[PDB]
Structure formats: structure tokens, C-alpha cells
């Protein structure tokens, strides 16, 4: 009569990363570094169930992913190769630059200052890929960076699933936009569930895929998807002002239309961000 668990290696490691997480939420250095880049990310709403990093056992006798990045001082992180995003993230360079990089330091600094006793204790070595969720099912990579989507196809290049990766909370999280002509007088997602309801044949244009994945989650089949279409705000922008879509959904907002003509609100519909770790041998 045994429970018999899997032996999760990455266990003690996503519980420190989500307990320094917790942690650079309470000592405000999180939401500095997102004023500091003066990016539009939320963090996570709710911590109140997370573990306290003082808590958090950080003694090499546990047989774990955690164990090694200590005897090494060292952790190697994954990421997409040859992505430029500006301020956002700059990974042309190694080692890289700009917000999400720049949170993964903040972390294993906090986690560094818990184990050891310095914000520079422990290296963090980052590794670039093609496909990062190969290279972590293969432990090259004890981590995926934190800015993948939570809703991530975790997948080789075959196209066929990863089962033994598993993921961490989605620590940060930016907001869908919705931009619609006035004319329409729905400035609000439940004036907008109505028109949609009472319409067919709707078409929904998207700048990302993440951005009609936020809204086909509240819509379904009722309307079409079109994302592939657009690379740029004034891509979307002409098409939703052409009327042949009925809404542009968009994370951002460079420049405004005119007031009188053309209406934006935020959903509040996330989209979420998550490291990935392996879960299992």
C-alpha cells in the first residue's frame, strides 16, 4: 500500500524560482524592473499560496536538478536564438539584454542570496535553440526562459508532444486589446459577446496568434480567426477600418485613430508567460 510518486527532479527547483518570484513581488523589485523598461506586464495576481523562500530547503543532499546548479554555482537557461524584441529582450547578444532577461537575473539573484550569501553566487549561463523544449527534454537546459506563452505547444520538431515537461506559474501576464469601429457602440467585452451572439459570419483579425487565442476561448466557432494576415498595427488597423473585420484584437498601441471613429478597450483577457522545466526522467 504505497503511494507511489514520480521522482520529479525539477520539484525543489520551481519551488525556489516560484518562492523568489514571491519574494521580488513583495520587495517591489519586480514592478520596478517593469516601470524601469516601462513594459506593460502585469505579475501575478495572487501569492498568497506560493512557497516563502525562507522556507525552501537549500541543501545539496537532495538527488535533484537543484543539487547540481548549486555544487556548480551554475544554471543554464534556453531560449529562441536569433530573437530581437528591443527593450523587451535583446538575445542577439549573449549574455542578453533588456526585460526578460533582466527578470531572469533578478531571480537567481534573490535565489542566490537564499542559497549562498550573494546576489552574484550563482552563474546563470544562457543557451540558445532552435527548439529549447528538445534541448529541455534532453537536460541540456535546466530551464526555458521565463517569456514563453503558457498556452505553448510543447512539442519536438517531429510536431509530436512532450509529456514529461511540465511548467511553472504564469509569474507574468500582458493584456488583449480590442479595437473597434464606435459606429458599432460597443466599448466593452459583454456589449461585444452580445453583438457577436446575435451576428454571424463575423471574422476576427489578430496581430498574434495568442492575441484570437485570448478571444477564441470566449467566442469559439461563432466567429473565424484570421492572424496570419498581419505583421504591423497599421496592417490590423486598415483592415478593421476597411470593415472587414469587426474587431482587431492587439497587445499594444502605437499611435491612436481618431477619437471619433474608432474605440479601444482592453479585455483584460491574458495572456500568459511561464518557464518550462522537465518533470520527469
Request: net charge negative.
Amino acid at each position: 500500500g504505497v503511494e507511489e510518486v514520480v521522482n520529479n527532479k525539477a520539484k525543489r527547483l520551481i519551488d525556489i524560482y516560484h518562492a523568489a518570484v514571491k519574494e521580488l513581488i513583495q520587495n517591489e523589485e519586480l514592478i520596478d524592473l517593469i516601470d524601469k523598461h516601462n513594459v506593460d506586464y502585469s505579475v501575478i495576481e495572487s501569492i498568497e499560496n506560493l512557497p516563502n523562500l525562507a522556507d525552501i530547503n537549500v541543501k545539496d543532499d537532495i538527488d535533484d536538478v537543484l543539487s547540481e546548479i548549486i555544487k556548480k554555482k551554475e544554471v543554464k537557461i534556453g531560449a529562441l536564438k536569433n530573437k530581437n524584441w528591443g527593450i523587451i529582450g535583446n538575445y542577439e547578444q549573449n549574455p542578453p539584454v533588456g526585460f526578460w532577461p533582466d527578470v531572469m537575473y533578478i531571480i537567481w539573484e534573490t535565489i542566490s542570496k537564499h542559497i549562498f550569501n550573494d546576489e552574484d553566487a550563482i552563474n546563470i549561463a544562457y543557451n540558445y535553440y532552435d527548439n529549447v523544449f528538445v534541448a529541455l527534454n534532453d537536460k541540456d537546459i535546466h530551464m526555458t526562459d521565463n517569456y514563453f506563452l503558457s498556452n505553448s505547444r510543447l512539442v519536438d520538431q517531429s510536431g509530436n508532444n512532450l509529456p514529461k515537461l511540465t511548467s511553472g506559474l504564469p509569474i507574468i501576464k500582458h493584456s488583449n486589446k480590442i479595437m473597434i469601429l464606435k459606429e458599432y457602440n460597443i466599448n466593452n467585452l459583454e456589449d461585444l459577446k452580445s453583438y457577436i451572439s446575435k451576428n454571424e459570419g463575423l471574422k476576427i483579425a489578430c496581430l498574434t496568434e495568442a492575441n484570437c487565442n485570448a478571444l477564441k476561448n470566449i467566442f469559439l466557432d461563432k466567429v473565424t480567426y484570421d492572424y496570419k494576415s498581419f505583421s504591423s498595427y497599421i496592417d490590423l488597423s486598415k483592415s478593421v477600418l476597411s470593415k472587414s473585420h469587426i474587431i482587431g484584437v492587439i497587445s499594444g498601441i502605437p499611435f491612436n485613430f481618431n477619437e471619433h471613429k474608432i474605440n479601444v478597450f482592453d479585455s483584460f483577457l491574458k495572456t500568459g508567460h511561464s518557464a518550462y522545466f522537465k518533470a520527469a526522467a
